[PDB]
Design a protein around this ligand. Structure first.
Ligand SMILES: *[C@@H]1O[C@H](CO)[C@@H](O[C@@H]2O[C@H](CO)[C@@H](O[C@@H]3O[C@H](CO[C@H]4O[C@H](CO)[C@@H](O)[C@H](O)[C@@H]4O)[C@@H](O)[C@H](O[C@H]4O[C@H](CO[C@@H]5O[C@H](CO)[C@@H](O)[C@H](O)[C@@H]5O)[C@@H](O)[C@H](O)[C@@H]4O)[C@@H]3O)[C@H](O)[C@H]2NC(C)=O)[C@H](O)[C@H]1NC(C)=O
Ligand SMILES: CC(=O)N[C@@H]1[C@@H](O)[C@H](O)[C@@H](CO)O[C@H]1O
Ligand SMILES: CC(=O)N[C@@H]1[C@@H](O)[C@H](O)[C@@H](CO)O[C@H]1O
Ligand SMILES: [Zn+2]
Length: 598
């Protein structure tokens, strides 16, 4: 009888979910120990426990065939069983899974251990990406110095790992096919539960792309005035080392030389943070305050007790790329961040605390539901708060921005600053997964892998390497997420939907009205808003219990991912920028790059 079996299945699921949570706790603890302290011993422990959990997952997936779950009445029960059938990498044979884990840790440890020699001191060779190299890329305006650090880092973080990356692609593909996906692309895309998801993103990207072109053109124009035409051409792709970021993913670090109105205020509170004696602890406490002010959950004692919020001062190797950790018990949540006292880092703190909040909000759910509605939702939470933190309105409240006059010109400066982070990022994010998808799908021959990467960066972002690269180089793994096997489409989704969340939260807070000149979207602060917090609670507490459109509906009554909100935010910038580019006869678009030899 199916009626009797469905009752037994419910009891089966409740026990199994609790078992999976407990087993994942053990794996997570070992993964935490390795990421905070990279050693051969900790790698071995992390990978051996993962192999053990994978073995158990195999048994679980096999056990689901004993239940007629597709025949059940409960949509909830069917959804849980469906989740249990999806093995991911755990579908691989024992030896293949062990090899993949060895390959993944080899790539992540390589990235984390990268050290370069000082440009001015060839005997000082202990400069790591975080913070040494990133500080130079963000602050130096010496184009040759920038080019040196670009080359040194990409050679060490990218090229050195080509063979491991090749084996990773092979095993990722094998795993996907064992789960009956065509490739790792489809495996990743399955997390969005929508068979038109790629086309939806193409459509949204196409709408925002013209604005990006205008920003690109104007920045290129302004860079030519700074560096001269020998360094930056009018018609070519922008040399990427000049954009204030190792991967040219976000350009806010060069705002001081590309700002629309240089005589008017440009928000950079890093100096005031230092002057007021800000610490990493204070920054996290302020983040905690923001969430609690919205009637959301305070950080538990375990967070403060166990988190790493500063780069360790011993000689040890660790992964410094910030991360949040759910240990699948009650209130055992942690962040690992190599925190610095800067404005950008203040946003990063809020980003990571967004993940933590999500963990706390759904910790009551069955294990399989203890994750985001889709990967983009998880990335978006903290960024919604960061948008309000970034406003002159909020920064004045916390005394970090002083003597600020919010006229038309200062507003354009602030909108442009935000766009250098939010619009510029969109083509970058798309290319990270367009690249990996093409490799996963077997669409690029191995002899063309490196120039396939730079071709996409050219086509979509209009940027290029500072020096000529070839198929002797392999540059993709120089980006953390590529070395660390972290899906990137989540960020494209996040940057779109975070404006849907922000707009709705702002309206709920009484902080945005499109017909009121005193309440513009770009100066909305949701701090202290219980109404905005209620929307977050309603959505986040769901976890992955329902398909993501239901989670969006719980927030604001909408069911569709839309670029309307992000375009609405930047509309006043679009009007000004289009006119400014025409006024200055600014060239738009770029010729095909010559910087990757086939
Ligand atoms: C990815 O896709 C794969 C297919 O491309 C898929 O692999 C298939 O999984 C099937 C299991 O669902 C499996 O089907 C079984 O086949 C057995 C014989 O297969 C042999 O010969 C094949 C060549 O003809 C070889 O290719 C194989 O290697 C094998 O050597 C059958 O003996 C078996 O049967 C039994 O089970 C059925 C199922 O019963 C179902 O459930 C209830 C049970 O209570 C039934 O009431 C209900 O009616 C329903 O049918 C019984 O009906 C039957 O009485 C037997 O007990 C079964 O059909 C198949 O072999 C396998 N490979 C191929 C090539 O087809 C993967 O599983 C997919 N992977 C994932 C992760 O989804
Ligand atoms: C700072 C720190 O915790 N370091 C630990 C060290 O104590 C231990 O000996 C090693 C074992 O691999 O792992 C790391
Ligand atoms: C002022 C306000 O809205 N406070 C809310 C309260 O109504 C709600 O019951 C609680 C549950 O999380 O969250 C908080
Ligand atoms: Zn994140």
């Amino acid at each position: 009888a199916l009626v009797k079996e469905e009752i037994q299945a419910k009891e089966y699921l409740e026990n199994l979910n609790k078992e999976l949570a407990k087993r994942t706790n053990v794996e997570t603890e070992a993964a935490w120990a390795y990421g905070s302290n990279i050693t051969d011993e900790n790698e071995k422990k992390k990978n051996e426990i993962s192999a053990e959990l994978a073995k158990f997952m195999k048994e679980v997936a096999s056990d689901t065939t004993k239940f007629q779950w597709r025949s059940y009445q409960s949509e909830d029960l069917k959804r849980q069983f469906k989740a249990l059938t999806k093995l991911g990498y755990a579908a691989l044979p024992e030896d293949d899974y062990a090899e993949l884990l060895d390959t993944l840790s080899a790539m992540e440890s390589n990235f984390a251990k990268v050290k370069v020699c000082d440009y001015k001191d060839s005997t000082k060779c202990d400069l790591a990406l975080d913070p040494e190299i990133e500080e130079v890329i963000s602050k130096s305006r010496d184009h040759e110095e920038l080019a040196y650090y670009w080359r040194e880092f990409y050679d060490k973080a990218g090229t050195a790992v080509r063979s491991q990356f090749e084996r990773y692609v092979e095993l990722n593909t094998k795993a996907a096919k064992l789960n009956n996906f065509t490739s790792g692309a489809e495996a990743w895309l399955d997390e969005y539960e929508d068979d038109t998801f790629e086309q939806q993103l193409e459509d949204i990207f196409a709408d925002i792309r013209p604005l990006y072109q205008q920003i690109h053109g104007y920045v290129r124009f302004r860079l030519r005035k700074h560096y001269g035409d020998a360094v930056v051409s009018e018609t070519g792709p922008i040399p990427m080392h000049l954009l204030g970021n190792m991967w040219a993913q976000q350009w806010s670090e060069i705002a001081d030389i590309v700002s629309p109105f240089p005589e008017k205020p440009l928000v950079d509170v890093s100096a005031e943070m230092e002057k007021q004696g800000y610490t990493p602890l204070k920054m996290f406490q302020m983040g905690d305050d923001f969430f609690t002010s919205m009637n959301l959950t305070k950080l538990p004692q375990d967070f403060w007790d166990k988190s790493i919020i500063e780069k360790p001062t011993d000689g040890r190797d660790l992964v410094c790329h910030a991360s949040a950790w759910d240990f699948y018990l009650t209130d055992d949540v942690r962040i690992k961040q190599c925190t610095r006292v800067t404005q950008d880092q203040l946003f990063t703190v809020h980003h990571e605390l967004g993940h933590i909040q999500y963990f706390l909000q759904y910790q009551h759910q069955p294990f399989v539901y203890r994750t985001g509605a889709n990967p983009g939702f998880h990335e978006a939470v903290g960024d919604v708060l960061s948008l309000s933190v970034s406003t002159p309105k909020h920064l004045e409240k916390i005394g970090l921005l002083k003597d600020y006059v919010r006229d038309d010109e200062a507003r354009i400066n602030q909108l442009f600053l935000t766009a250098l982070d939010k619009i510029v990022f969109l083509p970058f994010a798309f290319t990270m997964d367009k690249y990996r998808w093409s490799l996963f799908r077997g669409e690029v021959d191995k002899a063309n892998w490196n120039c396939a990467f730079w071709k996409l960066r050219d086509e979509y972002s209009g940027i290029e390497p500072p020096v000529v690269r070839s198929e002797k180089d392999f540059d993709a793994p120089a980006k953390y997420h590529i070395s660390a096997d972290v899906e990137y489409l989540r960020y494209l989704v996040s940057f779109i939907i975070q404006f849907q969340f922000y707009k709705s939260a702002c309206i709920k807070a009484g902080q945005y009205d499109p017909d009121n000149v005193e309440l513009p979207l770009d100066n909305c602060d949701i701090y202290g808003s219980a109404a905005a917090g209620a929307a977050f609670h309603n959505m986040l507490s769901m976890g992955a219990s329902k398909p993501w459109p239901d989670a969006l509906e719980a927030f604001n009554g909408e069911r569709i991912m839309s670029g309307k909100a992000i375009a609405e935010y930047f509309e006043p910038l679009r009007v000004w920028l289009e006119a400014e580019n025409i006024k200055n006869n600014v060239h738009i678009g770029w010729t095909t790059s010559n910087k990757c030899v086939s």
